Structure 1
Amino acid sequence: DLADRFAELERRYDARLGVYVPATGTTAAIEYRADERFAFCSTFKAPLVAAVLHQNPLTHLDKLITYTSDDIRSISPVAQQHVQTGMTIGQLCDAAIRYSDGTAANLLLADLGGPGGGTAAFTGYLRSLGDTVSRLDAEEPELNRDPPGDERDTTTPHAIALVLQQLVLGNALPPDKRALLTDWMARNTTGAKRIRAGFPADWKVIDKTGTGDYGRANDIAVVWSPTGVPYVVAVMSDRAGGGYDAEPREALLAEAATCVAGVLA
């Protein structure tokens, strides 16, 4: 039984687990703590890129953005390497999604602009997609650090699944912008041990991970069966019982995803 299996994993990892898979033609919604709030952590970077894509002509991707030492304040595997030359918006989108680049994300927030260094406009983008639940209040590094229970910088597996569904499978973005987003998630480098690990190799998996303090580990994905039937999978977790320095546990998500893949196969 699926809920039994998820509860078993929670006990195994001393964790809180949230899971949502939207209903399709022949499958019921899968939901476990799906309406509980979990920190976004880096999962926000996927809808962030969508916000920036949406807001601008496609060739805004070619705009060069410069930044300096005091802009590197978080894990930034790509931006740290290009600080001396700058990065285009396209390069920032790429790094934000594929390397979960924190500086790239901050610069993209600033590009989106408005109050809160773009956090207000980011939240507004989500509201435009009918998400009245999620909220972004801080950028990197602060957004991963809110205490367990605090609503700042949170989404829910349910809310984020419906947002991702519109972005990737629905018509939130024009086809060209949709393809850019989809392809970046498809080429993600951070996700091998999460949802990807739970689905057989003949299923296509695209994703954006999140990791944070208090043992936070998330992953949002779109997967396609070997016959091209897509499902959206959101998995979020925290281990508040270990305190701020609790280790995120990817294996939770891999196991949760295996359970899910078992039902969808």
Structure 2
Amino acid sequence: AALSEQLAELEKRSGGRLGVAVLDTATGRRFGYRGDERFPMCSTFKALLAAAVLARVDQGKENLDRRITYGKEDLVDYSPVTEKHVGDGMTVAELCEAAITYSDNTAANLLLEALGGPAALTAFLRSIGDNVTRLDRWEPELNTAAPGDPRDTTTPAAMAATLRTLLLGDVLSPASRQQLVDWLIANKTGDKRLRAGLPADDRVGDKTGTGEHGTTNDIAVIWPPNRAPILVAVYLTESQVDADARDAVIAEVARLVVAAWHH
């Protein structure tokens, strides 16, 4: 009857560990289910990576139009955008778009290099008040999702709070803020997850993640019509159901949250 026990049932059926955080900016109303447990980020870190790059652009230490050249030797598996541009390279802006909207692994690695590595991303997160999220490794090894491993993890509550600070706070310039929002709104990988359980008229930006040990994640900023945005972070790991069913778990979280929020 309570959202918390609805999620426990759903978590039971998934065979894994489910983490949910909701941060409604209209009210400050938070919700958490395992909100302070660590979960593997997998590709959800790429939303933070893009923010860190934009911070440099605001600082004048990076330009969105700067062209990065690379080769076949740089290509990491699942690189559907960067694999097409070994011959002409891609700009920093194009790499951010590829990392966010397609989870392009090579794009993420090239942006990490422009930033100074996973330690540089973690330091950026510390500088903006996130004392929990950490990136340690590169693509594709950060997707190992080994239980009990703190490397490359966040908590649902910390991720939602960090998304609020970056997408709605003062950390980024209004131009960079809107650009990060625009990239998330254009995401191509999340049609079967949170989006599949949200009202059709909701405006959604999201970043998915997928990894070993049955790991399937989705984090989002959501604008209901004529309403302040809501930040949602859903992490599922150690799952024992197949890929489509893991997607369905995330969609059902969105359905249960909206229902619980409207009644």
1:49 equivalent in structure 2: 50
1:168 equivalent in structure 2: 167
2:182 equivalent in structure 1: 183
Cα-to-partner distance string for 1:33-53 (whole Å, 9 max, x where unaligned): 010000110000011011011
2:99 equivalent in structure 1: 96
Give the C-alpha shift of residue 235 in structure 1: 0.4
Cα-to-partner distance string for 1:45-95 (whole Å, 9 max, x where unaligned): 011011011112397111110111121122111001111211111110110
Cα-to-partner distance string for 1:179-226 (whole Å, 9 max, x where unaligned): 110000001111111111111011111101111111111111010111
Q: Which runs of 4+ in 1 moved over 6 A?
A: none
Instruction: Classify 1:25/1:97 alpha carbon distance in 2 versus 1 (closer, same or farther; 3 Å).
Output: closer
8 A Cα contact 1:19 1:234, kept in partner: yes
Structure 1 counterpart of 2:73, from 59, 70, 75: 70
Letter in 1 for 2:138: E
Structure 2 counterpart of 1:86, from 85, 89, 95: 89
Give the C-alpha shift of residue 13 in structure 1: 1.3
8 A Cα contact 2:25 2:228, kept in partner: no
Instruction: Classify 1:178/1:154 alpha carbon distance in 2 versus 1 (closer, same or farther; 3 Å).
Output: same
8 A Cα contact 2:26 2:227, kept in partner: no
Instruction: Please state whether the residue corresponding to 1:11 is helix, strand or coil.
Output: helix
Q: 2: CA distance between counterparts of 1:159 and 1:188?
A: 22
Q: 1: CA distance between counterparts of 2:77 and 2:52?
A: 22
Cα-to-partner distance string for 1:6-27 (whole Å, 9 max, x where unaligned): 1111111112100001254546
Q: 1: CA distance between counterparts of 2:82 and 2:26?
A: 42
2:197 equivalent in structure 1: 198
1:264 equivalent in structure 2: 261
Letter in 2 for 1:152: R
* Gap regions ≥5 residues in structure 1: none
8 A Cα contact 2:14 2:240, kept in partner: no
Amino-acid identity (%):
53
Instruction: Please state whether the residue corresponding to 1:18 is helix, strand or coil.
Output: strand
Within-5 A mapping of 1:223-262: 223-239=222-238, 247=243, 249-262=246-259
TM-score normalised by L of structure 1 = 0.93
Instruction: Please state whether the residue corresponding to 1:234 is helix, strand or coil.
Output: strand
Letter in 1 for 2:177: R
Cα-to-partner distance string for 1:86-132 (whole Å, 9 max, x where unaligned): 1111110110001011000000000001xxxx100100111011111
Q: 2: CA distance between counterparts of 1:86 and 1:93?
A: 13
Instruction: Please state whether the residue corresponding to 1:124 is helix, strand or coil.
Output: helix
Q: 1: CA distance between counterparts of 2:254 and 2:202?
A: 12
Letter in 2 for 1:124: A
* Gap regions ≥5 residues in structure 2: none
Q: 1: CA distance between counterparts of 2:137 and 2:62?
A: 28
TM-score normalised by L of structure 2 = 0.94
The number of residues matched between the two structures is: 258
Instruction: Please state whether the residue corresponding to 1:22 is helix, strand or coil.
Output: strand
Letter in 2 for 1:68: G
